[PDB]
Amino acid sequence: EFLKPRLVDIEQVSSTHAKVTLEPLERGFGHTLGNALRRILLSSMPGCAVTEVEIDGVLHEYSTKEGVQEDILEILLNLKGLAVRVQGKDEVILTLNKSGIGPVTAADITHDGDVEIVKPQHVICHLTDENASISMRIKVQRGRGYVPASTRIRPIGRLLVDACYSPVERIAYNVEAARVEQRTDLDKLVIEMETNGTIDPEEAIRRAATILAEQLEAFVDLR
């Protein structure tokens, strides 16, 4: 008796910005699904985040490295913003080796078949000396939510990075009148999502709907 929605369009505005159209929707269902999906997308989407760094010759973040523009703290903060999509495993170790003057960016990370750098232009640090060289081992783990390093339950030199696993950055939804075959009371939901580029928008929508359905399974047979 209810007209169920369909995924009808996915407008990839940019690599990290997309719009997903759900149609048709009954009265009231547009806002209900909009808010439910917005909350689930903002809180529950899994992603890959940098969790551990090992820079050669570095003992702690509160130190400098000769020939490097940034402090170790700022390098770690830059690595925290590194957006990576890992395929086929929940944990990977990337290697970064660079020498000579120039910006050390995400494109300089040693290529791995199962790892993809969505934004190669992400600057990690800057080498300012001809003889300066930087070598680091970056641990990337899969997770969801926000896991601070302080709350995580190791030799000296392994620097813990706060993990913000969520790939979703901004969620907006709009409910607009959708021209139905005959009916004029149906609507459509346009969900605009801005991410870090590591999640497929259709994958995100299906993941959020699956989470909502699994959470509803308790209510569907109440006891």
Binding site: Y62, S63, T64, K65, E66, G67, V68, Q69, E70, D71, E74, I101, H126, T128, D129
Partner: protein, 100 residues
């Protein structure tokens, strides 16, 4: 930096002495998170000197209230600098502006 300020931020940041201020103008010959080396312009060098200004930055030292005093450079390699220019930001300072 404060989006809404009064214009006094630069004066406070410079006069506090927490920043590295260029004694003489020149070009950034070398820069890293701990040090800045300025190649002084020919019109500001005295006879019989190399004309090199070295600024060693304070890195992660406690203040009287156990807060962190850290100077980080705000200039890049090869940048031209003028006398009175901020070379390294101090604590609560952003590009020579007080940033509380």
């Amino acid at each position: 930096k404060p989006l809404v300020g009064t214009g006094m931020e630069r004066a406070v940041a410079v006069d506090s002495g927490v920043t590295a201020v260029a004694k003489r103008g020149g070009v950034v010959q070398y820069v890293d998170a701990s040090r800045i080396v300025i190649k002084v312009n020919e019109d500001e060098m005295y006879p019989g000197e190399a004309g090199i200004d070295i600024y060693n930055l304070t890195k992660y030292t406690r203040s009287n209230q156990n807060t962190c005093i850290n100077q980080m450079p705000c200039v890049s390699l090869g940048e031209p600098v003028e006398r009175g220019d901020v070379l390294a930001d101090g604590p609560s300072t952003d590009l020579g502006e007080l940033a509380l």
